């Protein structure tokens, strides 16, 4: 596989941090008044 | 708390249904506080342009990851052997069994075997390499974004459109029909003709090159000159080997019919001219309304004219042109119902008459577009059901619709849900007891005092296209008839070595269960018609609720009165029809992939005599095949189906959770 | 097959159309 | 009322008389259908290139043009044209008439609109229009000599799909 | 009325003839769907770049920079002989005047906020257009040389197409035998 | 709710009499039943006999009758537009 | 400093030599077919390689040699590809030099495609081979 | 907050009222009815949504309405 590293890079970034910030921002938001 | 902002009411709640409300009610723009209609309507623009963009990106994104992590290159070479890799596993979870085990289709990493038959569609439109993919998944993600500055660009001021410009019929129609249905299907000739032709025949066509290889030898000399026929002369040969030269033709326009021999899938030059015959028929269509020139048809005309004089109709069609063009809802279930008709036959065509090459030997891929596509069709049709009840709710004004045809189905609306009633109780009563019969009598050690129809009527119009099995010789299977005659020397030979070869799934022999199971059909059918026509037409009143219009399309109940009152709504109504509607696509794909399964396992007599009773459904077809499945994962190893054996048990899980 | 290249230019047509999805979803949301 | 050409027969009530060479003749009443003013535009533009045609195979029957004998070698009439398809000719001409003619079906447009008299493309760079008679003498004539031209441009095209020959070759024997 | 270039047609309501060159000649209507300061724009735009294109096929046809990418006089084998990366400095400096010259207001909407008029760049070093009886005269003359050079650019490049010898290389060599 | 738009021209065709009004036919308003009833059997007649002709079709059909085939549907508007004319006092 | 028909030519080049690295592979697959214990051709799989990978190297091959011989009226100077009307102002690709390689892989084909109907492992093996010298000595003389 | 309407098809039985669990009605003085009085809602801010004033009307289809709306605190019956 060409550019091997991306997937091992990219993978833990989309699943674990991204839906972290993401759940943490719309929190936020829906509760802030 | 300001998250519901659209609404002050949602926007108060100090509880958590404030969150869920509002995640239901976002994109329910209608009920909004203070949305006006052209408000309404450019939001709408945008969010059709954001879906088409996500379309787009999804699309994209497919062919980008084939490009990079799948085996096209090696797939094209031999496609009947080489396994199709859909996309890269990278889980970290993973132990290394599963790592090996995962590890198929010719490269060293982990991979998953496609079942979305890609290869089989790109293969056959021309390309080749994982160049072309690549560059078709730029273009794909250029135009995504272009749809995207689009969405933005005519939401900004002095680009904003008018109401006028929004409910023009005659232009939109004559516009998509010429143009998005018409042009579209033409150009798809065109790169049929000019690439996809080519490339099937081993020659390279590609934007380097297209200018210079001319798709046929005379060029388009014959097309100008009047001599179209010529673009019928030397089609392919029999023994043509698929993307190369040997055996192959040069014509690019013919009706050949039938398959090809060899990749069992229909002729490509048949699907050249069917397209530019479909794009010569839509312009034709698309240049029928008036729109700035006074030639063309009014719609509101056509409607108004069409009632019948001996008044059975009351009106006729008066007033529904406004009711129309008023209700996005109207507008959205008649979409959603022509949408999931041709999704159905999309999904039975394309087993029936495969146009991919070497995608009728893809089992798999077969049953999982078919699945696929027909459970979309079971939701369309859910959809457009629904809406149409929402369109009873919200936009219907008998006023305007005085003695009109939607308040005659209104009028009539009782007979119309007691007769689907009937019609289901009959087809349930007698379906069930054949099937309870046949169980009784197999399992007393008779089999020979079943009740088993012939299915006479499908086998006659069988026969009627050419089928020679059942002996009936009408039409298409007499060679002495008007019909047979008529095409014998332009589609019949090609026709008939396709419909009488046992070799694929075109017409496929019928027999008892075929007859028992089409009829459980219209018993579903008809049973989640009467749910939703039963809950379309009591939307805006009964006798238990005379005012349920003023409550809404969606409410809980109306309180334990009056006897109780409990999933009164014509929301209850849907959300009873979705699990009718989830039967039906269970039965029909348990009908398709056991039908389908037997002949390929080369014993359809299993089929034919374990699916007159429902043991044999239950242990010839569930039990039977499910060895492999839940052997994916046991305490001696683990497979490539391990993870489907995981799904399966998933699903079995989260299905409980539901009750 | 595919370079790193062609890879890199795909993240960067992708990331435009980030871009452009922000600018609707800002648009729709008024 | 009955027509003048026809007298066993109504006069037309889209025929008022006003336009060269009315005299009434409509028998199958395609004036009820179309527009007046498009059904002349279609007739005065039949006539025209009928007229020019009929020019035409006269002077090709009387000479031909430096070089057009090699190409063409003795296949006149309309036999060159399937020869000026393989050579530039004929598509040098449909491309320039097709220009003309998007500038004609603006005329067109604006015709419809009854801010055009039909068949008007003012093009009268040498001055015969001095008078309001003379103008109606050469309309009446135009129109006629436009119907004779389409008939006159039918029996010579015919006639030489019969014989092979052309319009004045025939005379000649 | 009527308009003076086509006889036949009623004449544009936004040409009135304040603007050089005006014979009334919009056939297609497209003065009434865009704005005529953005189309009076782009014709001097579109002119200015065709007058510059065939004074350069002009004077490269017959003479040119000493090197071997730069001597060959057709010029469309020309942009492909020379080194690309001089097309980059072209275009870079064509950008960068395209930013500065437009006072970097280059939208339909924003050139004509805070408005100059219509091919205006205010770039008149020698300054012969103080006097207005030559202003004029200078303007219907630079509209008609535009006009006639986006004819005589097309019939230069296209004619490099088919025959490959430069304009006045295919001026001379114009067969007049030949046997289709 | 808004005005909904409809081209230039269009008019009220709701008819509840034996007949439409002959607005209905469009162009084809201002034709006597009489050529309509003619036209409609001239046209049968053509139809018919171009799609004898191309019944049995083969690789090269003459395009005229191909052409003259489409007739035989346009003489059923045809005979309904003369039922419409004949009942409209024309 | 490389003109617009020196970086075609270098995208030629890398062409031919991705089809010239991809030619292996069906050597391989040839012995394979081979060394097995019923030994048959596949006929489809040879003929596809070939109707991809060797005639985009022909292709290619064709490209780069106008490009030679013509210069930069092949590159883009005579406008658009074309086929038929006006007259081909460029000189055949058969007058560069380096179009003997293109006269030897083309009519080896015609060997792989016997070879296809005849069966012969080794006939294939050796007119791989003979593509992939071929192909090793036009790029190497190219540069 | 719930919107609780009284129509003129009410006879002031006051069942309604008695079975209010949340005091939101109340009978007043009117004349359309052979009772003299007709039933009110003037504090539907208090009003959780329950319907029992709606199965306690005798009247065929009923008079007093509750469309629920807005969730508030005391609509909810939250004693938290
Ligand atoms: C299936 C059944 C098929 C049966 C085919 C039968 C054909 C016979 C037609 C019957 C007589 C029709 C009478 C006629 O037409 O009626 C006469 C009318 C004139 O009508 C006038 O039309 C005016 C406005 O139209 C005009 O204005 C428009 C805008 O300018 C048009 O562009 C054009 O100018 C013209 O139509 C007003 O309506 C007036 O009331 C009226 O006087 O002719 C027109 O409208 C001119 C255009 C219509 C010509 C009809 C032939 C078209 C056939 C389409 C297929 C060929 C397509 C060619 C495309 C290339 C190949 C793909
Ligand atoms: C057939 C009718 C007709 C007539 C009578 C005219 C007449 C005229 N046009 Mg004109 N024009 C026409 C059609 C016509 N045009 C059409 C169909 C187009 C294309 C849409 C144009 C495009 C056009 C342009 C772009 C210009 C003119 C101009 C002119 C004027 C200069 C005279 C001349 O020879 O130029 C005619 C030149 C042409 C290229 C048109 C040729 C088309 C045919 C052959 C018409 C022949 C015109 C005739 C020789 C002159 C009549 C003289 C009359 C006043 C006594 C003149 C008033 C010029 C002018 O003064 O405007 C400011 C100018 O710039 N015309
Ligand atoms: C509508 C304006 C127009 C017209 C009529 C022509 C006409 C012509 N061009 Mg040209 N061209 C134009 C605009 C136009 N050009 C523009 C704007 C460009 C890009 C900046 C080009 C770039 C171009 C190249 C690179 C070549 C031509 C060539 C040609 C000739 C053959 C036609 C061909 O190959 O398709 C035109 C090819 C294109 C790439 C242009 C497509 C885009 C334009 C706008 C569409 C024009 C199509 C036109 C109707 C075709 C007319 C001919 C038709 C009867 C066959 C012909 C003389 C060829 C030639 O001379 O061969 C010796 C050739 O190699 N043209
Ligand atoms: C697609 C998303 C995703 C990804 C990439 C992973 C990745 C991983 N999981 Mg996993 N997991 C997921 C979803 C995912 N999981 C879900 C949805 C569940 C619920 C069913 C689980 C439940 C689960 C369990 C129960 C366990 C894992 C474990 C692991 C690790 C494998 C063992 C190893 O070598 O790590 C060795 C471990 C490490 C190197 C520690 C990594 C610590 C990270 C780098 C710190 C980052 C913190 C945070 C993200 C910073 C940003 C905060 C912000 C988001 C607010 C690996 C990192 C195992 C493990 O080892 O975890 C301890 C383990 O025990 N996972
Ligand atoms: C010719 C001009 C033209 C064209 C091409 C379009 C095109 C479109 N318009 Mg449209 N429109 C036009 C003029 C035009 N418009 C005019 C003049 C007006 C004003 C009166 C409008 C007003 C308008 C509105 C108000 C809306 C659109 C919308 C749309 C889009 C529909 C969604 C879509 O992509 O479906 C694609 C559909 C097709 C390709 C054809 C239908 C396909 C059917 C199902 C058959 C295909 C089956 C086939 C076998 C499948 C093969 C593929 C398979 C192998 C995968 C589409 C891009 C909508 C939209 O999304 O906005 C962004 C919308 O809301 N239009
Ligand atoms: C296997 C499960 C099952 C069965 C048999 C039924 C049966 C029925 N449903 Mg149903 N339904 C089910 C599951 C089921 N439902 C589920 C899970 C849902 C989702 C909530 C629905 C949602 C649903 C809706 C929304 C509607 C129905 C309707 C119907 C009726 C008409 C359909 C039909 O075939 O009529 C034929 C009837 C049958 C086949 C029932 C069996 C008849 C038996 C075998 C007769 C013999 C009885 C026996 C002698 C009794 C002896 C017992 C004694 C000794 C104690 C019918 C009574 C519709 C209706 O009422 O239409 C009129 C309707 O509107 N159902
Ligand atoms: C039989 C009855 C009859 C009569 C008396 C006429 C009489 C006339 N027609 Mg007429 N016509 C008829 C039937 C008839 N038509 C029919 C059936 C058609 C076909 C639908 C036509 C088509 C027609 C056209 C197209 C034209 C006339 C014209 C004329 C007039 C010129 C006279 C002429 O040149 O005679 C010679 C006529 C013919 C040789 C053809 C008609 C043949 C019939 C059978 C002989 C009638 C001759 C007539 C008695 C001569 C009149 C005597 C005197 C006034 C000269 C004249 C008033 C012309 C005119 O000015 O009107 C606009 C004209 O252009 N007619
Ligand atoms: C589309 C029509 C057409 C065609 C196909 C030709 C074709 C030809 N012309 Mg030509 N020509 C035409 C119209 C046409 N012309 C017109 C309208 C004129 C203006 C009067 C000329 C004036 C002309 C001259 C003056 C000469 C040719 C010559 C030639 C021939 C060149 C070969 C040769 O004999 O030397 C060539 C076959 C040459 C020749 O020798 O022909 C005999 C020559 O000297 N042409
Ligand atoms: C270019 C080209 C081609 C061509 C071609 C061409 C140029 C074809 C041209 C055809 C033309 C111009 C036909 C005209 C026909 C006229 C008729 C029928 C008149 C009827 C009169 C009637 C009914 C009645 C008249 C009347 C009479 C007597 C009595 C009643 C009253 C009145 C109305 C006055 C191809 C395709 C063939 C091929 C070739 O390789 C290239
Ligand atoms: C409830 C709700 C309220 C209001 C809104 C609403 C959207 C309207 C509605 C929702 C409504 C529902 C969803 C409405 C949508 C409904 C259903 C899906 C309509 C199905 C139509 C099938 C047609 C008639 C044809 C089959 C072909 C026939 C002509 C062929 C014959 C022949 C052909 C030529 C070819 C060969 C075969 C043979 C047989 C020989
Ligand atoms: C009265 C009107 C009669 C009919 C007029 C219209 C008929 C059809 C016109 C077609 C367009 C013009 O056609 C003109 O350009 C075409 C494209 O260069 C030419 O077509 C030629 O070149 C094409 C492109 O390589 C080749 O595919 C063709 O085989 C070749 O014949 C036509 O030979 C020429 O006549």
Same mark, same amino acid.
């Given at each position: 596989?060409?550019?091997?590293?991306?997937?091992?890079?990219?993978?833990?970034?989309?699943?674990?941090?991204?839906?972290?910030?993401?759940?943490?921002?719309?929190?936020?938001?829906?509760?802030?008044? | 708390?300001?998250?519901?902002?659209?609404?002050?009411?949602?926007?108060?709640?100090?509880?958590?249904?404030?969150?869920?409300?509002?995640?239901?009610?976002?994109?329910?723009?209608?009920?909004?506080?203070?949305?006006?209609?052209?408000?309404?309507?450019?939001?709408?623009?945008?969010?059709?342009?954001?879906?088409?963009?996500?379309?787009?990106?999804?699309?994209?994104?497919?062919?980008?990851?084939?490009?990079?992590?799948?085996?096209?290159?090696?797939?094209?070479?031999?496609?009947?052997?080489?396994?199709?890799?859909?996309?890269?596993?990278?889980?970290?979870?993973?132990?290394?069994?599963?790592?090996?085990?995962?590890?198929?289709?010719?490269?060293?990493?982990?991979?998953?075997?496609?079942?979305?038959?890609?290869?089989?569609?790109?293969?056959?439109?021309?390309?080749?390499?994982?160049?072309?993919?690549?560059?078709?998944?730029?273009?794909?993600?250029?135009?995504?974004?272009?749809?995207?500055?689009?969405?933005?660009?005519?939401?900004?001021?002095?680009?904003?459109?008018?109401?006028?410009?929004?409910?023009?019929?005659?232009?939109?129609?004559?516009?998509?029909?010429?143009?998005?249905?018409?042009?579209?299907?033409?150009?798809?000739?065109?790169?049929?003709?000019?690439?996809?032709?080519?490339?099937?025949?081993?020659?390279?066509?590609?934007?380097?090159?297209?200018?210079?290889?001319?798709?046929?030898?005379?060029?388009?000399?014959?097309?100008?000159?009047?001599?179209?026929?010529?673009?019928?002369?030397?089609?392919?040969?029999?023994?043509?080997?698929?993307?190369?030269?040997?055996?192959?033709?040069?014509?690019?326009?013919?009706?050949?019919?039938?398959?090809?021999?060899?990749?069992?899938?229909?002729?490509?030059?048949?699907?050249?001219?069917?397209?530019?015959?479909?794009?010569?028929?839509?312009?034709?269509?698309?240049?029928?309304?008036?729109?700035?020139?006074?030639?063309?048809?009014?719609?509101?005309?056509?409607?108004?004219?069409?009632?019948?004089?001996?008044?059975?109709?009351?009106?006729?069609?008066?007033?529904?042109?406004?009711?129309?063009?008023?209700?996005?809802?109207?507008?959205?279930?008649?979409?959603?119902?022509?949408?999931?008709?041709?999704?159905?036959?999309?999904?039975?065509?394309?087993?029936?008459?495969?146009?991919?090459?070497?995608?009728?030997?893809?089992?798999?891929?077969?049953?999982?577009?078919?699945?696929?596509?027909?459970?979309?069709?079971?939701?369309?049709?859910?959809?457009?059901?629904?809406?149409?009840?929402?369109?009873?709710?919200?936009?219907?004004?008998?006023?305007?619709?005085?003695?009109?045809?939607?308040?005659?189905?209104?009028?009539?609306?009782?007979?119309?849900?007691?007769?689907?009633?009937?019609?289901?109780?009959?087809?349930?009563?007698?379906?069930?007891?054949?099937?309870?019969?046949?169980?009784?009598?197999?399992?007393?050690?008779?089999?020979?005092?079943?009740?088993?129809?012939?299915?006479?009527?499908?086998?006659?119009?069988?026969?009627?296209?050419?089928?020679?099995?059942?002996?009936?010789?009408?039409?298409?299977?007499?060679?002495?008839?008007?019909?047979?005659?008529?095409?014998?020397?332009?589609?019949?030979?090609?026709?008939?070595?396709?419909?009488?070869?046992?070799?694929?799934?075109?017409?496929?022999?019928?027999?008892?269960?075929?007859?028992?199971?089409?009829?459980?059909?219209?018993?579903?059918?008809?049973?989640?018609?009467?749910?939703?026509?039963?809950?379309?037409?009591?939307?805006?009143?009964?006798?238990?609720?005379?005012?349920?219009?003023?409550?809404?399309?969606?409410?809980?109940?109306?309180?334990?009165?009056?006897?109780?009152?409990?999933?009164?709504?014509?929301?209850?109504?849907?959300?009873?029809?979705?699990?009718?509607?989830?039967?039906?696509?269970?039965?029909?794909?348990?009908?398709?992939?056991?039908?389908?399964?037997?002949?390929?396992?080369?014993?359809?007599?299993?089929?034919?005599?374990?699916?007159?009773?429902?043991?044999?459904?239950?242990?010839?077809?569930?039990?039977?095949?499910?060895?492999?499945?839940?052997?994916?994962?046991?305490?001696?190893?683990?497979?490539?189906?391990?993870?489907?054996?995981?799904?399966?048990?998933?699903?079995?899980?989260?299905?409980?959770?539901?009750? | 097959?595919?370079?790193?290249?062609?890879?890199?230019?795909?993240?960067?047509?992708?990331?435009?159309?980030?871009?452009?999805?922000?600018?609707?979803?800002?648009?729709?949301?008024? | 009322?009955?027509?003048?050409?026809?007298?066993?027969?109504?006069?037309?009530?889209?025929?008022?008389?006003?336009?060269?060479?009315?005299?009434?003749?409509?028998?199958?009443?395609?004036?009820?259908?179309?527009?007046?003013?498009?059904?002349?535009?279609?007739?005065?533009?039949?006539?025209?290139?009928?007229?020019?045609?009929?020019?035409?195979?006269?002077?090709?029957?009387?000479?031909?043009?430096?070089?057009?004998?090699?190409?063409?070698?003795?296949?006149?009439?309309?036999?060159?044209?399937?020869?000026?398809?393989?050579?530039?000719?004929?598509?040098?001409?449909?491309?320039?008439?097709?220009?003309?003619?998007?500038?004609?079906?603006?005329?067109?447009?604006?015709?419809?609109?009854?801010?055009?008299?039909?068949?008007?493309?003012?093009?009268?760079?040498?001055?015969?229009?001095?008078?309001?008679?003379?103008?109606?003498?050469?309309?009446?004539?135009?129109?006629?000599?436009?119907?004779?031209?389409?008939?006159?441009?039918?029996?010579?095209?015919?006639?030489?799909?019969?014989?092979?020959?052309?319009?004045?070759?025939?005379?000649?024997? | 009325?009527?308009?003076?270039?086509?006889?036949?047609?009623?004449?544009?309501?936004?040409?009135?003839?304040?603007?050089?060159?005006?014979?009334?000649?919009?056939?297609?209507?497209?003065?009434?769907?865009?704005?005529?300061?953005?189309?009076?724009?782009?014709?001097?735009?579109?002119?200015?770049?065709?007058?510059?294109?065939?004074?350069?096929?002009?004077?490269?046809?017959?003479?040119?920079?000493?090197?071997?990418?730069?001597?060959?006089?057709?010029?469309?084998?020309?942009?492909?002989?020379?080194?690309?990366?001089?097309?980059?400095?072209?275009?870079?400096?064509?950008?960068?005047?395209?930013?500065?010259?437009?006072?970097?207001?280059?939208?339909?909407?924003?050139?004509?906020?805070?408005?100059?008029?219509?091919?205006?760049?205010?770039?008149?070093?020698?300054?012969?257009?103080?006097?207005?009886?030559?202003?004029?005269?200078?303007?219907?003359?630079?509209?008609?040389?535009?006009?006639?050079?986006?004819?005589?650019?097309?019939?230069?490049?296209?004619?490099?197409?088919?025959?490959?010898?430069?304009?006045?290389?295919?001026?001379?060599?114009?067969?007049?035998?030949?046997?289709? | 709710?808004?005005?909904?738009?409809?081209?230039?021209?269009?008019?009220?065709?709701?008819?509840?009499?034996?007949?439409?009004?002959?607005?209905?036919?469009?162009?084809?308003?201002?034709?006597?039943?009489?050529?309509?009833?003619?036209?409609?059997?001239?046209?049968?007649?053509?139809?018919?006999?171009?799609?004898?002709?191309?019944?049995?079709?083969?690789?090269?059909?003459?395009?005229?009758?191909?052409?003259?085939?489409?007739?035989?549907?346009?003489?059923?508007?045809?005979?309904?537009?003369?039922?419409?004319?004949?009942?409209?006092?024309? | 400093?490389?003109?617009?028909?020196?970086?075609?030519?270098?995208?030629?080049?890398?062409?031919?030599?991705?089809?010239?690295?991809?030619?292996?592979?069906?050597?391989?697959?040839?012995?394979?077919?081979?060394?097995?214990?019923?030994?048959?051709?596949?006929?489809?799989?040879?003929?596809?390689? @070939? *109707? %991809? &990978?060797?005639?985009?190297?022909?292709?290619?091959? $064709?490209?780069?040699?106008? !490009? #030679? +011989?013509?210069?930069?009226?092949?590159?883009?100077?005579?406008?658009?590809?074309?086929?038929?009307?006006?007259?081909?102002?460029?000189?055949?690709?058969?007058? @560069? *030099? %380096? &179009?003997?390689?293109?006269?030897?892989?083309?009519? $080896?084909?015609?060997?792989? !495609? #016997? +070879?296809?109907?005849?069966?012969?492992?080794?006939?294939?093996?050796?007119?791989?081979?003979?593509?992939?010298?071929?192909?090793?000595?036009?790029?190497?003389?190219?540069? | 907050?719930?919107?609780?309407?009284?129509?003129?098809?009410?006879?002031?039985?006051?069942?309604?009222?008695?079975?209010?669990?949340?005091?939101?009605?109340?009978?007043?003085?009117?004349?359309?009815?052979?009772?003299?009085?007709?039933?009110?809602?003037?504090?539907?801010?208090?009003?959780?949504?329950?319907?029992?004033?709606?199965?306690?009307?005798?009247?065929?289809?009923?008079?007093?309405?509750?469309?629920?709306?807005?969730?508030?605190?005391?609509?909810?019956?939250?004693?938290?």
């Amino acid at each position: 596989m060409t550019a091997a590293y991306l997937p091992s890079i990219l993978v833990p970034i989309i699943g674990l941090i991204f839906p972290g910030l993401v759940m943490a921002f719309a929190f936020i938001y829906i509760e802030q008044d | 708390t300001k998250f519901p902002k659209f609404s002050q009411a949602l926007a108060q709640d100090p509880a958590t249904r404030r969150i869920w409300y509002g995640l239901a009610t976002a994109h329910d723009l209608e009920s909004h506080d203070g949305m006006t209609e052209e408000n309404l309507y450019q939001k709408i623009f945008a969010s059709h342009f954001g879906h088409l963009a996500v379309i787009f990106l999804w699309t994209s994104g497919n062919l980008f990851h084939l490009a990079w992590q799948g085996n096209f290159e090696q797939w094209v070479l031999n496609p009947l052997k080489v396994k199709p890799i859909a996309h890269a596993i990278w889980d970290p979870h993973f132990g290394q069994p599963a790592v090996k085990a995962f590890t198929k289709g010719g490269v060293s990493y982990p991979v998953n075997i496609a079942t979305s038959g890609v290869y089989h569609w790109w293969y056959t439109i021309g390309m080749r390499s994982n160049t072309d993919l690549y560059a078709g998944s730029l273009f794909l993600l250029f135009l995504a974004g272009v749809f995207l500055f689009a969405g933005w660009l005519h939401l900004q001021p002095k680009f904003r459109p008018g109401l006028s410009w929004f409910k023009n019929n005659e232009s939109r129609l004559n516009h998509h029909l010429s143009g998005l249905f018409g042009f579209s299907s033409l150009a798809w000739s065109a790169h049929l003709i000019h690439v996809a032709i080519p490339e099937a025949r081993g020659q390279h066509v590609g934007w380097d090159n297209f200018t210079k290889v001319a798709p046929h030898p005379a060029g388009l000399q014959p097309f100008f000159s009047g001599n179209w026929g010529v673009y019928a002369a030397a089609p392919d040969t029999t023994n043509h080997i698929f993307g190369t030269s040997e055996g192959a033709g040069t014509a690019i326009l013919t009706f050949l019919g039938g398959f090809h021999p060899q990749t069992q899938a229909l002729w490509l030059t048949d699907i050249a001219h069917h397209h530019l015959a479909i794009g010569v028929v839509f312009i034709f269509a698309g240049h029928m309304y008036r729109t700035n020139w006074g030639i063309g048809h009014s719609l509101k005309e056509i409607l108004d004219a069409h009632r019948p004089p001996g008044g059975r109709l009351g009106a006729g069609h008066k007033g529904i042109f406004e009711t129309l063009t008023n209700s996005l809802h109207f507008q959205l279930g008649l979409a959603l119902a022509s949408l999931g008709v041709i999704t159905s036959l999309v999904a039975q065509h394309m087993y029936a008459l495969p146009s991919y090459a070497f995608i009728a030997k893809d089992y798999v891929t077969q049953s999982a577009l078919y699945t696929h596509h027909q459970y979309i069709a079971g939701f369309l049709m859910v959809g457009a059901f629904a809406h149409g009840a929402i369109f009873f709710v919200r936009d219907y004004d008998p006023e305007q619709n005085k003695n009109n045809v939607l308040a005659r189905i209104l009028d009539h609306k009782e007979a119309i849900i007691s007769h689907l009633s009937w019609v289901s109780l009959f087809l349930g009563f007698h379906t069930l007891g054949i099937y309870v019969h046949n169980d009784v009598v197999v399992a007393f050690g008779t089999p020979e005092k079943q009740i088993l129809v012939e299915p006479v009527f499908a086998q006659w119009i069988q026969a009627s296209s050419g089928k020679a099995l059942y002996g009936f010789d009408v039409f298409l299977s007499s060679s002495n008839s008007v019909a047979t005659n008529a095409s014998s020397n332009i589609w019949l030979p090609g026709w008939l070595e396709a419909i009488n070869s046992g070799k694929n799934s075109l017409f496929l022999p019928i027999g008892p269960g075929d007859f028992l199971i089409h009829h459980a059909i219209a018993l579903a059918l008809h049973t989640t018609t009467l749910i939703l026509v039963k809950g379309a037409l009591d939307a805006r009143g009964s006798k238990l609720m005379p005012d349920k219009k003023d409550f809404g399309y969606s409410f809980p109940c109306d309180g334990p009165g009056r006897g109780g009152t409990c999933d009164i709504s014509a929301w209850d109504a849907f959300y009873l029809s979705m699990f009718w509607m989830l039967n039906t696509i269970g039965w029909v794909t348990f009908y398709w992939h056991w039908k389908h399964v037997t002949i390929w396992q080369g014993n359809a007599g299993q089929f034919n005599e374990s699916s007159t009773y429902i043991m044999g459904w239950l242990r010839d077809y569930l039990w039977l095949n499910s060895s492999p499945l839940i052997n994916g994962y046991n305490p001696f190893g683990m497979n490539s189906l391990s993870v489907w054996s995981w799904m399966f048990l998933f699903g079995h899980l989260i299905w409980a959770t539901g009750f | 097959m595919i370079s790193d290249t062609q890879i890199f230019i795909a993240l960067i047509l992708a990331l435009v159309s980030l871009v452009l999805a922000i600018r609707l979803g800002r648009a729709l949301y008024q | 009322a009955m027509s003048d050409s026809v007298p066993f027969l109504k006069q037309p009530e889209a025929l008022d008389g006003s336009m060269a060479g009315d005299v009434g003749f409509d028998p199958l009443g395609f004036s009820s259908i179309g527009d007046i003013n498009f059904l002349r535009e279609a007739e005065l533009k039949h006539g025209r290139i009928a007229m020019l045609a009929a020019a035409g195979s006269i002077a090709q029957d009387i000479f031909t043009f430096p070089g057009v004998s090699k190409v063409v070698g003795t296949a006149k009439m309309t036999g060159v044209h399937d020869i000026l398809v393989k050579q530039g000719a004929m598509g040098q001409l449909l491309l320039w008439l097709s220009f003309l003619e998007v500038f004609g079906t603006i005329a067109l447009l604006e015709t419809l609109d009854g801010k055009r008299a039909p068949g008007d493309f003012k093009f009268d760079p040498l001055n015969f229009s001095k008078n309001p008679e003379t103008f109606k003498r050469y309309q009446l004539a135009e129109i006629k000599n436009g119907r004779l031209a389409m008939m006159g441009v039918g029996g010579m095209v015919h006639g030489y799909f019969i014989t092979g020959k052309g319009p004045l070759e025939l005379l000649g024997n | 009325d009527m308009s003076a270039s086509v006889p036949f047609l009623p004449r544009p309501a936004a040409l009135d003839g304040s603007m050089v060159g005006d014979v009334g000649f919009d056939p297609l209507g497209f003065t009434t769907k865009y704005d005529i300061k953005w189309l009076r724009e782009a014709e001097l735009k579109h002119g200015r770049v065709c007058m510059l294109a065939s004074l350069g096929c002009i004077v490269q046809e017959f003479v040119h920079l000493p090197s071997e990418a730069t001597s060959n006089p057709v010029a469309s084998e020309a942009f492909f002989q020379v080194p690309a990366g001089g097309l980059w400095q072209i275009f870079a400096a064509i950008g960068i005047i395209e930013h500065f010259s437009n006072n970097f207001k280059m939208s339909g909407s924003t050139m004509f906020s805070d408005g100059r008029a219509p091919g205006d760049l205010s770039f008149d070093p020698l300054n012969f257009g103080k006097n207005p009886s030559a202003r004029a005269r200078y303007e219907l003359a630079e509209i008609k040389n535009g006009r006639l050079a986006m004819m005589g650019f097309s019939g230069m490049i296209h004619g490099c197409f088919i025959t490959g010898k430069g304009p006045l290389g295919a001026l001379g060599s114009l067969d007049w035998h030949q046997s289709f | 709710y808004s005005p909904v738009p409809s081209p230039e021209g269009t008019k009220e065709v709701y008819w509840e009499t034996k007949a439409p009004s002959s607005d209905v036919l469009g162009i084809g308003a201002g034709v006597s039943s009489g050529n309509f009833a003619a036209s409609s059997v001239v046209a049968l007649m053509i139809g018919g006999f171009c799609t004898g002709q191309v019944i049995p079709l083969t690789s090269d059909p003459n395009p005229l009758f191909l052409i003259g085939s489409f007739l035989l549907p346009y003489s059923w508007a045809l005979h309904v537009a003369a039922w419409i004319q004949k009942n409209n006092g024309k | 400093a490389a003109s617009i028909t020196d970086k075609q030519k270098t995208v030629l080049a890398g062409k031919i030599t991705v089809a010239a690295n991809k030619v292996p592979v069906l050597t391989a697959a040839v012995e394979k077919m081979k060394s097995g214990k019923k030994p048959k051709m596949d006929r489809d799989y040879v003929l596809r390689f @070939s *109707a %991809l &990978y060797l005639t985009t190297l022909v292709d290619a091959m $064709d490209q780069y040699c106008l !490009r #030679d +011989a013509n210069g930069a009226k092949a590159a883009g100077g005579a406008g658009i590809p074309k086929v038929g009307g006006f007259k081909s102002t460029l000189a055949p690709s058969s007058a @560069s *030099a %380096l &179009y003997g390689n293109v006269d030897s892989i083309k009519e $080896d084909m015609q060997t792989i !495609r #016997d +070879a296809a109907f005849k069966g012969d492992f080794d006939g294939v093996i050796k007119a791989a081979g003979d593509i992939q010298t071929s192909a090793t000595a036009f790029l190497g003389q190219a540069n | 907050s719930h919107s609780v309407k009284v129509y003129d098809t009410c006879i002031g039985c006051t069942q309604c009222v008695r079975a209010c669990p949340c005091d939101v009605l109340e009978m007043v003085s009117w004349d359309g009815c052979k009772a003299g009085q007709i039933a009110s809602a003037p504090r539907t801010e208090d009003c959780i949504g329950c319907k029992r004033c709606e199965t306690a009307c005798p009247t065929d289809f009923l008079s007093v309405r509750v469309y629920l709306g807005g969730e508030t605190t005391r609509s909810m019956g939250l004693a938290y």
